């Protein structure tokens, strides 16, 4: 039973490690290679940044939280870590969303949009993503104890204390996952159906890649987002193990992003391999 507790820090730790290394390779390979420095890859840059913060901070602090048995760092950095994590994860999702939009417009408007869209617009949509994420999550997270008048959070554990109140939990969760997944999936549907007219290559490859992307986003972000809804009705409903796995499943999206967006392109991987030796 003593072997058990090290294996988890090895798996989660090495997964975090792989995460940050991967996204660092994304950022590096974009700044180094001038050919892949297209407007579409700026969104990949912002994405890899969010996934980097997530990779190094969220993953390791949650690794600590889980491996110790409690949150020993205090209310200040609990509120902090949670605010940060939720904000930058929402930022990741909004990034994916804005990527979806961009790809839709690149498909429907095949010649006009790619020229009309400038770098300034990309920076604007990125900033919009981060700002909206921050506004939607941060103020509600920290000041939920100043408004209620009591920190509902237990001394040992560290969770968002608006979870007890379903009314806000739903509204925040849907604007973070449900609404955005609906949007992404629907305009990706528009992409697949409008782009490529059994269909030999176009519809085949498009449907394949789109499927992989959507499957990733869902398989990672859904379990927690549906468990957050489960626990909002009943407190003893969900086992802490399953909860932990929901959290981690959410984290590994930020690990798999350089595989669905970057490496799914042919050149990116070639650019990656030189960083080895």
């Amino acid at each position: 039973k003593t072997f058990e507790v090290v294996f988890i820090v090895l798996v989660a730790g090495s997964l975090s490690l792989v995460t940050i290394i991967g996204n660092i390779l994304v950022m590096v390979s974009i700044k180094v290679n001038r050919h892949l420095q297209t407007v579409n890859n700026y969104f990949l840059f912002s994405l890899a940044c969010a996934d980097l913060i997530i990779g190094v901070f969220s993953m390791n602090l949650y690794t600590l939280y889980t491996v110790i048995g409690y949150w020993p760092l205090g209310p200040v950095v609990c509120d902090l870590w949670l605010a940060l994590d939720y904000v930058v994860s929402n930022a990741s999702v909004m990034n994916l969303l804005i990527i979806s939009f961009d790809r839709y417009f690149c498909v429907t408007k095949p010649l006009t949009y790619p020229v009309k869209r400038t770098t300034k617009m990309a920076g604007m949509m990125i900033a919009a993503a981060w700002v909206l994420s921050f506004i939607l999550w941060a103020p509600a997270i920290l000041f939920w104890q100043f408004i209620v008048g009591v920190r509902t959070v237990e001394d040992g554990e560290c969770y968002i204390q608006f979870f007890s109140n379903a009314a806000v939990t739903f509204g925040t969760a849907i604007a973070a996952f449900y609404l955005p997944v609906i949007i992404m999936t629907v305009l990706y549907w528009h992409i697949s159906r409008a782009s490529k007219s059994p269909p030999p290559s176009r519809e085949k490859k498009v449907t394949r890649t789109i499927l992989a992307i959507l499957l990733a986003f869902i398989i990672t972000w859904a379990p927690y987002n549906v468990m957050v809804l489960i626990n909002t009705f009943c407190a003893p409903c969900i086992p802490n193990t399953v909860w932990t796995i929901g959290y981690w499943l959410c984290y590994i999206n930020s690990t798999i992003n350089p595989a669905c967006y970057a490496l799914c392109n042919a050149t990116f991987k070639k650019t990656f391999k030189h960083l080895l030796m």
Epitope: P200, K205, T209
Partner: nanobody
């Protein structure tokens, strides 16, 4: 990797026709089939507007609202070289014609160097 060279750049009087040809090369683990190719013209100081675009894999033709009816595009899938023939030109088509190749979702984006097409009268 791929770099794209153009041809057919010359002088023509109004009403005449030209054939600009774009040749792509240098494929490894990627296929010319995996690239959708378009023609962009640039007038002096004006926006780099896109004339026409073709997908060789599907054979799907997509033209711009300005060049519809005069311009025709196709290719040679085995030779990995595309052909754009334009007919009944006006002196308003005086520009440098460059060749672009986007992979799905614009990840691998390539441009050429371009050829000059000056129309007389």
């Amino acid at each position: 990797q791929v770099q794209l060279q153009e041809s057919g750049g010359g002088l023509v009087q109004a009403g005449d026709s030209l054939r600009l040809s774009c040749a792509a090369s240098g494929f490894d683990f990627d296929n010319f089939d995996d690239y959708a190719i378009g023609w962009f013209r640039q007038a002096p100081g004006q926006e780099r507007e896109g004339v026409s675009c073709i997908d060789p894999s599907d054979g799907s033709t997509i033209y711009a609202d300005s060049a519809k009816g005069r311009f025709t595009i196709s290719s040679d899938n085995a030779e990995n070289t595309v052909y754009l023939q334009m007919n009944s030109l006006k002196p308003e088509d005086t520009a440098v014609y460059v060749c672009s190749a986007w992979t799905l979702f614009h990840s691998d984006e390539y441009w050429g160097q371009g050829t000059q097409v000056t129309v007389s009268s």
